[PDB]
Design a protein around this ligand. Structure first.
Ligand code: SF4
Ligand code: SF4
Ligand code: SF4
Ligand code: SF4
Lengths: 438, 449
């Protein structure tokens, strides 16, 4: 089992793998099921219509009171039910409003100037000193090393494709306090202009034309916990990884700034992570819609940082995911809301929530979100059942690597765990030396 | 055949019976935090390389800047080029992103809030009421398993529980007034007593930081640093693994406190504040005190950072461990010989503090920590040479003789009988090492008995 060998073997020639037509336009973030007016409101189990996450809260409370870890899933006792939800809620500590999407707010600042760390370090002047390194080869090695220090299990670099950057972001006015944020979300254009630094005006989020590159990180979720989907421990590994995303973005942006460049964090905001991840060679797009990686399958979170730092783009990877998803359809059969299509890929979105103009499996994401208040979590059954999520799907026939075609919650709490939920049985797969960084 | 290393076995073999291992006598009094070398007026000021007397960290900054300009990664250590020198300091600086003023010591300020109520996460989750609902679990056995599982999720490589020994809680904390903005914080530090009272929840008044008498337990976490980077001490990459682990500590405290709160209990974070981490770690069984003064663990030696959380959550205390560190430190003295400031004693343990920076009244090796801090502006970093040269920091110390585990004495022979390569070499997530990561795997049996 050698991940470096595997990635080398399945490396493509250069060029975005995403097939597009002339109808493709940048996508307004408000259109996602989380935020759009058509999908935002959902009934709770009492028949009261609320913001989807508030109705999901009502189900978490009902489950705790009834000693359940998920829908129709009895916990060992009320204590266990409570612990799962306590772990879930805690995981989100370093995340704003489920995904950190508002750009240049809270943790996602587009400049480091006001950060306590930057202020403390100001006399050294690292963020003001011109770069001492402009060589993209050395920079790629440096920033990838920093990325691993910052908590990425996978890291890749692509040229920034503006097609995947949201046309308009969901955000809040800059002087609105957190307690009012959910009630004062607004739309705001993201535009590219000839300016020296990322800047936000009253009217626009402005990314410089010099913002050449995107650095994409994979943040691995815990297999045992995700396999409890749609129950509470799947929610907990999801949540902890969002806080890991946030710390990754801040750490890496600060490193890049202290190297003499600018850096834009994003977590779930600014653009479509799956498209960037595919273009940066982390994995391939799949039927369920996720980026499937050789190391973790789809059981990995994504975040990304945009920068003018000169870098060497990674090659896209083709290890046969498209052909496997063609015949598999297991996520689609197991999906509790029938959100995932069993049909062929097309360029035409199923609803407002899809971006038309790119060849993909088109899924109904309102159907997906509808299951979240019903189950009181973030589901994840598709991730859990995907063959690529299983530990070792990789075999070697003596010449090369190939996919092996052949492929409760109390026990999780009482079972194997390790730091950040990583697994020492597999952790060697993400070891890195210079040769695999650049 | 070679027996595969079993860290759980090793800890079981060397487990002690219950009781604080730290030997004390009647001169022992709680220690005022302002006495540490970082904060005390006698030690706080250090000359820079031009002889200008400044706050120690400002003089160290001057040296970092000088090194970058001169293409160096440390004192008299030439870098590959200026770009490499720059990169090491950029990585170091970035590492500190989630840490306030080198340690997060001010209690109930910034990240170290003693209540979760104002946190954005708590506000978002308020409708579920997890922080208001009485505990559904009071069994200390189940709580210990739950909270240790949460601790591993929250980034701890080691976790242990002890009853809170107030002897190691600072008598007065270093902090700032609540109305003082971050940019003035380093100018406006004050002392505030930490007191124990019959109150329901941790609370701060104008005059006191008040910990409830019900605050029974301390949870101690070990946060592993990176071996390859620390072995570059006193140069910049050792500074970088130090820095990143401080931000990991902060994340750990906030994550774990929120879990404990959402379980229906209260929780006090601390990072480098509130009390003496080495003493708590020893009492919680993470490892043993050592000549250099650090807690030496079987897994990482001293090359591991510590943080701690205080709580009324019922828990099962862990047993202390004795794997012979004291007897090795008695005869080894490598850290003392290699220390660039001669801060570490080569003499025996005593109950008498060397200077104001030591807490008298506990049996320990007494080191001169003003001498230690003095080397930091000189070298432009946080040194760490003692951690780097300690044989317990090597990954290779444990052997099995067919009957039991033991320490390989050959690793202590004296004499034994670069930074570019680190940047170009092995790394993995959070700087953890997959060659050793199995050592911190955990099942219920090793979380609670
Ligand atoms: S379950 Fe099957 S069809 Fe769905 S994403 Fe995984 S491999 Fe593709
Ligand atoms: S998360 Fe659940 S409901 Fe949503 S697509 Fe996956 S399986 Fe279906
Ligand atoms: S170097 Fe030797 S004396 Fe110093 S702490 Fe390590 S084992 Fe003890
Ligand atoms: S950090 Fe350096 S100066 Fe301080 S005690 Fe250790 S070796 Fe000596």
């Amino acid at each position: 089992k050698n991940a470096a060998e595997i990635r080398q073997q399945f490396a493509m020639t250069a060029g975005s793998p995403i097939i597009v037509n002339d109808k493709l336009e940048r996508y307004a973030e408000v259109r996602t099921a989380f935020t759009h007016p058509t999908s935002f409101f959902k009934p709770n189990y009492k028949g009261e219509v609320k913001p989807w996450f508030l109705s999901a809260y009502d189900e978490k409370v009902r489950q705790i009171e009834n000693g359940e870890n998920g829908p129709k899933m009895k916990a060992k006792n009320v204590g266990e039910a409570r612990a799962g939800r306590a772990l879930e809620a805690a995981g989100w500590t370093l995340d704003i409003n489920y995904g950190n999407i508002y750009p240049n707010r809270f943790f996602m600042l587009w400049s480091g100037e006001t950060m306590t760390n930057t202020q403390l370090w100001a006399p050294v002047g690292l963020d003001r000193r011109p770069p001492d390194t402009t060589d993209p080869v050395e920079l790629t090695n440096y920033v990838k090393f920093a990325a691993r220090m910052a908590g990425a299990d996978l890291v890749g670099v692509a040229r920034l494709n503006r097609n995947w950057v949201y046309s308009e972001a969901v955000t809040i006015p800059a002087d609105v306090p957190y307690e009012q944020s959910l009630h004062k979300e607004i739309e705001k254009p993201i535009v590219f202009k000839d300016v020296p630094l990322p800047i936000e005006t009253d009217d626009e989020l402005i990314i410089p034309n010099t913002c050449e590159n995107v650095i994409v990180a994979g943040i691995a979720m815990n297999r045992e916990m995700m396999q409890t989907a749609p129950n509470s421990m799947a929610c907990a590994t999801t949540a902890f990884c969002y806080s890991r995303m946030c710390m990754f973005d801040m750490w890496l942006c600060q490193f890049i700034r202290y190297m003499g460049y600018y850096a834009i964090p994003s977590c779930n905001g600014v653009g479509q992570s799956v498209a960037f991840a595919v273009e940066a060679g982390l994995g391939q797009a799949s039927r369920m819609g996720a980026c499937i990686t050789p190391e973790f399958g789809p059981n990995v979170r994504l975040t990304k940082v945009f920068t003018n730092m000169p870098l060497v783009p990674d090659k896209p990877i083709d290890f046969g995911v498209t052909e496997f998803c063609e015949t598999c359809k297991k996520c689609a059969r197991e999906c509790p809301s029938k959100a995932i299509t069993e049909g062929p890929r097309t360029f035409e979105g199923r609803s407002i929530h899809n971006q038309s103009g790119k060849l993909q499996w088109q899924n109904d994401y309102n159907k997906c979100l509808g299951y979240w208040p019903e189950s009181g979590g973030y589901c994840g059954v598709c991730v859990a059942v995907c063959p690529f999520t299983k530990g070792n799907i990789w075999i070697h026939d003596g010449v090369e690597w190939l996919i092996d075609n052949t492929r409760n919650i109390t026990e999780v709490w009482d079972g194997k765990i390790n730091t950040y939920g990583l697994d020492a049985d597999h952790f060697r797969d993400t070891v890195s030396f210079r040769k695999d960084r650049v």
